[PDB]
DNA sequence: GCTGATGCGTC
DNA sequence: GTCGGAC
DNA sequence: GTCCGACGACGCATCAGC
């Protein structure tokens, strides 16, 4: 009803009418969304921003039920169901020039402000807009900027990013309080709130299972628990939780889940949206493993099986009945236009009493001259977009490891024994093209050790694990990663580790604001006596290690680089180090590099070796940059992978 | 018509 | 993708 | 164990700038 600027979505016995801040019908201000998560921002315990959102969700649903999707899909930072493949194009770039043009200031010192602050939020708001005139424009409102944030990604072609940047400065000379720091992280793609995709479900489920949609106004059922006793409330909510997100993992689309909920609730939901092929939903995920004990440990006395990890891309096919065939990835997004190739190959893959079906699969690249697996880098080297099987010139073999509905059945609770049996009898392998992923089932821990040796061996990464019978469904909800990864670099003794020179090093951003956020590290190439810049890092280190590396870096930060220091055309770093500092950096492979130098000219002309995953393991005390690793031995280990 | 910077995607 | 922090 | 956001290499698609 009142200004918006004291609105108070944290506020104990939060009212949904009474406590918005503003009227029946009346569009949600933006000011509501922004100060809803400030509120979130304060906090560290999820189930605290859980109730925060559910107190503007509730209001939303009493009072402005039509800004309820955007008011959600500002909240993910999305900007539609990730299919439909709507993007901002925006980026840091754009963004600090359209905050310089709207300030006034000069780029380059905007540029400067964001890297000390590790936040663009902070500077966008701080900084008061020349296109302002002595009036305010109206408020924003919650839907006005979401149609806004929509037209930015609908923008193309020439001429196209000064359009962009026009809307951009539009939005932050009618700003208010906080409203232009979450307009410019939104903009960023860092809202960084601390509340993401569960949190906002369980919001949601929570909201309008205390405030239903669809009463007439005034409504009669403002809260719905409190006729509960606390014990009984939670229990309704975890129940009510799980029809949402159970209907959501089969159909993570907020277009088609919304207006059901609005009109026939959320204990109807289940049955109008349902799984079907040519819906993307969410892939079944994995917890790493420390070795083959730990396994055993996880599972007790569960049946599982065993089978190879490999190295491509994963590939959800779904098979409409009547013959579409759609693609999507791991992250729900459409891949069909990049598949000509399997789409034609689909009716030699499938038994002809197949009607329809939802397979998952990883796409790997494959050498059908040599017949052999290819590695990860050279699957990324096919095209996206509007892909002729004329032009394909990476052929991918697809190996199938699931099975998640098949002749108008959804498998999504069966145990994977059945699953894989039906995938195993249904479907045709053919060398090179489909074939399942090769298996084991046993108990017995020798026969693992070697089968996890094998798959190395046969261009794997490891071993998947996966129970058969017991807790072996397709049920995201109950547990998203289900499966186990047993990965050689995780074994605390057998991956590839690097001494590696600290050259470089980066203010940190979000989380790590105030403090580096990232290194730049070198290889020493005793040809050259040089050091080379090898790869970047950023993870690894607790808290308390980084702390400690601010502590002892800070005296060797130089105003220019050494030279005998070579980057080429890495990332230049915010402050330069003296070389001195030695880490032990572990990674999973090496990568032929566009940009790093390390050891180029040693197995390439043009490209140097980097680090693929690399992680902080601890510092080498014991080692000068001398005798850090050389850039022959990583050409050395490069050419190991074979 | 070409190139480079870069946003977004894959991992 | 890996990793650590807060719960 | 869950959820989240710090941070990694790298390649296609796109468009500003030539
Ligand atoms: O490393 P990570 O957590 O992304 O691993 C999960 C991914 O591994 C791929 N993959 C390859 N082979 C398999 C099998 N046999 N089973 C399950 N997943 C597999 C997937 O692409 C998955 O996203
Ligand atoms: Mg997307
Ligand atoms: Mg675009
Ligand atoms: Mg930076
Ligand atoms: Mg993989
Ligand atoms: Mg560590």
Redesign the pocket.
């Given at each position: 009803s009142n200004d918006p600027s004291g609105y108070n979505p944290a506020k104990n016995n939060y009212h949904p009418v009474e406590d918005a801040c503003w009227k029946p019908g009346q569009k949600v201000p933006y000011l509501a969304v922004a100060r809803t998560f400030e509120k979130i921002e304060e906090?560290?315990?999820?189930?605290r921003m859980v109730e925060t959102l559910s107190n503007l969700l509730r209001s939303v649903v009493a009072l402005s039920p039509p800004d309820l999707l955007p008011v959600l899909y500002l909240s993910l930072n999305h900007l539609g169901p990730?299919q439909q493949?709507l993007?901002?194009?925006?980026?840091?770039?754009?963004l600090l020039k359209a905050v310089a043009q709207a300030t006034g200031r000069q780029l380059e010192s905007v540029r400067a402000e964001a890297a000390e602050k590790?936040d663009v939020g902070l500077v966008a708001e701080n900084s008061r807009s020349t296109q302002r005139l002595m009036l305010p424009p109206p408020p924003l409102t919650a839907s006005g900027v979401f149609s806004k944030f929509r037209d930015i990604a609908r923008?193309?072609?020439?001429?196209?990013?000064?359009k962009k940047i026009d809307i951009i400065k539009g939005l932050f000379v009618a700003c208010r309080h906080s409203e232009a720091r979450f307009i410019a992280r939104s903009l960023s793609?860092?809202?960084?709130?601390?509340?993401?995709?569960?949190?906002?479900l369980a919001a949601l489920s929570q909201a309008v299972s205390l405030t239903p949609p669809g009463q007439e106004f005034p409504p009669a059922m403002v809260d719905a628990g409190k006729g509960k006793t606390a014990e009984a409330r939670k229990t309704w909510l975890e129940e009510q939780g799980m029809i949402l997100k159970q209907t959501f993992c089969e159909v993570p689309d907020l277009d088609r889940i919304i207006p059901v909920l609005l009109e026939h609730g959320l204990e109807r939901l289940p049955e109008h949206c349902k799984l079907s092929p040519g819906i993307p939903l969410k892939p079944m995920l994995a917890?790493?493993t420390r070795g083959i004990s730990e396994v055993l440990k996880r599972f007790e006395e569960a049946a599982f099986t065993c089978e190879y990890k490999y190295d491509?891309?994963?590939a959800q096919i779904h098979a409409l009945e009547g013959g579409e065939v759609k693609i999507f990835?791991?992250?729900?997004?459409d891949?069909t236009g990049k598949y000509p190739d399997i789409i034609s190959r689909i009716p030699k893959i499938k038994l002809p009493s197949v009607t329809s079906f939802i397979l998952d699969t990883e796409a790997v690249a494959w050498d059908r001259e040599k017949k052999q697996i290819q590695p990860?880098?050279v699957l990324?080297?096919?095209?996206?977009?509007?892909?002729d099987a004329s032009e394909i010139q990476v052929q991918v073999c697809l190996y199938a490891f699931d099975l998640i509905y098949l002749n108008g059945e959804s498998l999504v609770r069966e145990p994977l024994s059945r699953r894989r049996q039906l995938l195993r009898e249904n479907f045709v392998e053919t060398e090179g093209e489909f074939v399942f992923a090769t298996s084991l089932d046993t108990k017995d821990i020798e026969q693992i050790a070697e089968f996890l040796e094998q798959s190395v061996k046969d261009s794997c990464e490891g071993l998947m694990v996966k129970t058969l019978d017991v807790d072996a469904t397709y049920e995201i909800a109950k547990?998203?990663?289900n499966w186990l990864?047993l990965?050689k670099d995780?074994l605390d003794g057998v991956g590839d580790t690097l001494d590696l020179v600290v050259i470089g090093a980066?203010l940190?951003?979000?989380?790590?604001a105030g403090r580096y956020?990232?290194f730049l590290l070198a290889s020493y190439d005793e040809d050259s006596e040089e050091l080379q810049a090898i790869?970047?890092?950023?993870?690894?280190?607790?808290?308390?290690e980084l702390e400690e590396h601010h502590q002892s870096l800070k005296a060797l930060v130089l105003p220019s680089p050494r030279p005998y220091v070579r980057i080429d055309g890495?990332?230049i770093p915010d402050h330069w180090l003296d070389p001195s500092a030695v880490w032990e950096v572990?990674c999973?492979d090496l990568?032929?590099?566009?940009?790093?130098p390390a050891a180029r000219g040693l197995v390439d002309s043009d490209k140097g070796?980097?680090?693929?995953?690399?992680?902080?393991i601890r510092v080498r005390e014991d080692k000068q940059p001398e005798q850090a690793t050389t850039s022959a031995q990583v050409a050395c280990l490069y050419r190991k992978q074979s």
């Open positions: 906090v560290s315990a999820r189930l990730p493949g993007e901002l194009g925006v980026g840091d770039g754009v590790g923008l193309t072609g020439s001429a196209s990013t000064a793609g860092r809202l960084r709130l601390g509340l993401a995709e569960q949190s906002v917890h790493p491509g891309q994963r990835s791991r992250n729900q997004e891949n990860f880098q990324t080297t096919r095209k996206r977009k509007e892909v547990r998203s990663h990864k990965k995780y980066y940190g951003r979000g989380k790590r956020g990232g790869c970047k890092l950023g993870t690894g280190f607790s808290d308390e890495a990332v572990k999973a990568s032929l590099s566009p940009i790093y070796i980097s680090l693929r995953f690399p992680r902080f």
